[PDB]
């Protein structure tokens, strides 16, 4: 166990990020990030159809393309490791804009319908042995309004996002992670998670879940 | 360079803490803290006179007793190391309650008058090779002088408290200032608090260097 | 705020243009351009060494002369202003003909090695508070093959050059500018940039970066 | 003379657009377009007969209804100006799908038969003091106008150098007079290339400016 | 051409000012100064050696760090304009405490050795297209420039007629070209004499206006 620099909340142009998968990997890799998870949006059906009909970009991975999406991440795991000794973890941001809950899952293997209740989504992700994070809206909300309700539900809560800290997770002593919520280049510099863990995916998930050796770290230019 | 667990803002019953020094050291050592600074209060003359006048406790080390205070900590350095492999750094909290600024000095050697202007205090502390932290008032707390004037003091402090007890102060992070996180310990239960994790060799000069540079510094919430 | 006529991509005989600096400045001045950047080439070493070897002209400012070049441009800012109320901005075209990227920097202060990676080059230009443009090759290329990758990299992309529009910039809704890529007198008639901005260098760079009040205009 | 943002090529559900007239106006108004022309289709006889015959929608304003169509637009001129300070100009798209020329006319007052020769159409429109633009087929879609550009060099006040999200290099390379429009049918077509023109904010001044074409730029609304 | 409020003589903690660069900029920005030049000291060799030797602070930017100093100022040009619409101009105070001439240069691009003769300094600065001002010693403080005014009649673009809260009648009585600045080191020095100049809001226009000196006034900010 050394301390690893991690970012569990990162988007590409496969959903609504600015940048291609390869480039997001090169950026984080060249900046010494040890562990990154790609968490592109899957979206509730209302939101997706609202976008289709207004001719807006979907900004999401469709259920039909989700397998092809994970396949791209499976392949990038290889490049990320061989080129940077970086651990890339396939994930997803389960994004419900109708009921206003965004849930990040790390080490996902199957699509989960974002329109399902929070507990069913989470039970589904736990059946996949994914890590489950309550994401916090970025500075620029159902989970955060009902934190006591969801106390044993999530493995960790976002205490930090972009350049912002959220005192409510700390005050309640909840389990915490800190991520960039990356969409564009300059978001690479953000609060990150430092975790004391063997450098393998099961170990990393365990360490976040335990949350006894997890700190938050602000990466600056 | 392994990452070390650090708390640079800790008080004992020598100033206004609830607990005896020995007991504070034992508690931090048994909780596996790697670096602790004891930063008991020195307070401006006017505040002292006022407490003296109201017959309330001084809650501070007097100028006359400062070397005796340092002498207790130097002996505590020995025990801290022998019993826990812990680095105790003598420090102080320079407490101006008249003008409302609290400055934590880590690895202090000489008394400095808390009444002086901020930059005079800091220049004095730099001559001693002490690490100089801008302390944040705790949430159980007025408009505080350093925090109202952050841009003015940006090149004055080696670090600002981004966190204190169980609270985070987003202003530090938003501006990307150098940061530390401490307990501001007074009571048993303040041991469980935000702390600083720093990548550094386990020696006092190396630790101060790491904090000043502030590129391998994280914050860490110690829980029961 | 008035809309300004700008040309951010212009060469002189100090690199590979046909004309003297003074004459290029007058030409643009007299045709009523509000903002012009002189962007003479600096070239990667491999390409310089090749030309040296084949006895071909360098067509570039050498690293050693780069300050003397900018010096000439500082002096021309004074004259361009006094004579024509025109804003001349020192610039450069970072020309890598080994890996085929040309990068135009507006309000450049220091030489940047064109042999560096694109991202290193750009981060260096941003450190100088320069405006960074993806030059498109004239109709008579690594960046254009990799536009998605460089989306957050450039402040703007050439959507037009000489008399040619490049549909790919627009189709992608990328930030755009339009310039002459001037080398010859007749290149003064070309696609140019109309930008709504205060008439000052910082304001202009900001308005190109924002790109919300930027149009293209054909000078005939 | 400030620079006005303009769209001279917009359709409503009165021809083959998807949207109510009122909506179209509200959409352009609230996006800060200064000048809009509604240019619904009128269509050559042969095409209309063919459509009637196949039971297809006409997607055109009939000759019988043309004046009612203009009346709908005159009333919207008032609301466009009052609500948004926007100049709405009644126009039309003269649509010959038999010989393949689409001609956009801005500030139209009378119906003109799309089956007439290009040149006779343009003369009829110039007798009405209408601005006359050669419309370029949108990318999604051999066109007569565009195949015979030299023939029509002095025929049109302007050619479409841009349409929806596409640029057509042929107009610029020839250094012809140009405008850029949305060719709007669907809600999302409001984000398109548009024309930026330096002009007094009135319909005669505007038509004059496009015609001169020396203070005309194109502008991508995103 | 409206009248711009200007301060061409301001120091930061990078030389001997009390305040961070960012603060200085924020202070002038929020007080509505239109144009500021940061003019930290560069100092003659002999003075620097003397200071090193006495263990005093250098209170200067070294030749080695000059380009980094300018880089700090270029980045602040951007933030000054974006946050305040203020023009920040990189400058310098050429400080010869051996022969006693202080020369302020506005829009500087290269380091110039303060140990050079007055005239050689000014030529080097005019080769950079910098504006060149004779700085007047502040009152709190026999100076070469001021003792030899006739000698330097056509040497400087302007002389300091005012500094902090003091006016120097010698410049006006001679009817020389003038500017008025704060010579800022401490927070309270923002309230000082300043220059009001009728100019287009750009650095070349501004330098030209001061140089002509026919639309330049002095203004006490309180
Ligand atoms: Cl989020
Ligand atoms: Cl999001
Ligand atoms: Cl405190
Ligand atoms: Cl306290
Ligand atoms: Cl030690
Ligand atoms: Cl090119
Ligand atoms: Cl070229
Ligand atoms: Cl069409
Ligand atoms: Cl159509
Ligand atoms: Cl009218
Ligand atoms: Cl002075
Ligand atoms: Cl001084
Ligand atoms: Cl400027
Ligand atoms: Zn997103
Ligand atoms: Zn989200
Ligand atoms: Zn977000
Ligand atoms: Zn997100
Ligand atoms: Zn206390
Ligand atoms: Zn305190
Ligand atoms: Zn406290
Ligand atoms: Zn305290
Ligand atoms: Zn060339
Ligand atoms: Zn080129
Ligand atoms: Zn070229
Ligand atoms: Zn070129
Ligand atoms: Zn249609
Ligand atoms: Zn058509
Ligand atoms: Zn069409
Ligand atoms: Zn149409
Ligand atoms: Zn000074
Ligand atoms: Zn001086
Ligand atoms: Zn002075
Ligand atoms: Zn001075």
Coordinates of N, CA and C in Angstrom, one line a residue, chain A residues 7-12 24 28 36-40 69 179-183:
Chain A
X7 N -9.2 9.9 -9.5 CA -10.3 10.7 -9.9 C -11.4 9.8 -10.4
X8 N -12.5 9.7 -9.7 CA -13.4 8.7 -10.0 C -14.6 9.3 -10.8
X9 N -14.5 10.5 -11.4 CA -15.6 11.2 -12.0 C -15.2 12.1 -13.2
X10 N -15.2 11.5 -14.4 CA -14.6 12.0 -15.6 C -15.4 11.6 -16.8
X11 N -15.6 12.6 -17.7 CA -16.4 12.5 -18.8 C -15.6 12.7 -20.1
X12 N -16.1 12.1 -21.2 CA -15.5 12.2 -22.5 C -16.6 12.7 -23.5
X24 N -8.4 12.3 -23.1 CA -8.7 12.3 -21.6 C -7.7 11.5 -20.9
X28 N -4.8 13.0 -18.1 CA -4.7 12.5 -16.7 C -3.4 11.7 -16.5
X36 N -8.0 6.5 -12.6 CA -9.1 7.3 -13.1 C -10.2 6.4 -13.5
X37 N -11.4 6.9 -13.3 CA -12.6 6.2 -13.8 C -13.3 7.0 -14.7
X38 N -13.6 6.5 -15.9 CA -14.4 7.1 -16.9 C -15.9 6.9 -16.6
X39 N -16.6 8.0 -16.3 CA -18.0 7.9 -15.9 C -18.9 8.8 -16.7
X40 N -19.1 8.3 -18.0 CA -19.9 9.0 -18.9 C -21.4 8.8 -18.6
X69 N -19.7 1.0 -25.5 CA -19.0 2.0 -24.6 C -18.0 1.3 -23.6
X179 N -13.5 14.5 -6.5 CA -13.3 14.2 -7.9 C -13.3 15.5 -8.7
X180 N -12.9 15.4 -10.0 CA -12.9 16.6 -10.8 C -14.3 16.9 -11.5
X181 N -15.1 15.8 -11.7 CA -16.2 15.9 -12.6 C -15.8 16.5 -13.9
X182 N -14.8 16.0 -14.5 CA -14.1 16.5 -15.7 C -15.0 16.5 -16.9
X183 N -15.2 17.7 -17.6 CA -15.7 17.8 -18.9 C -14.8 18.4 -19.9

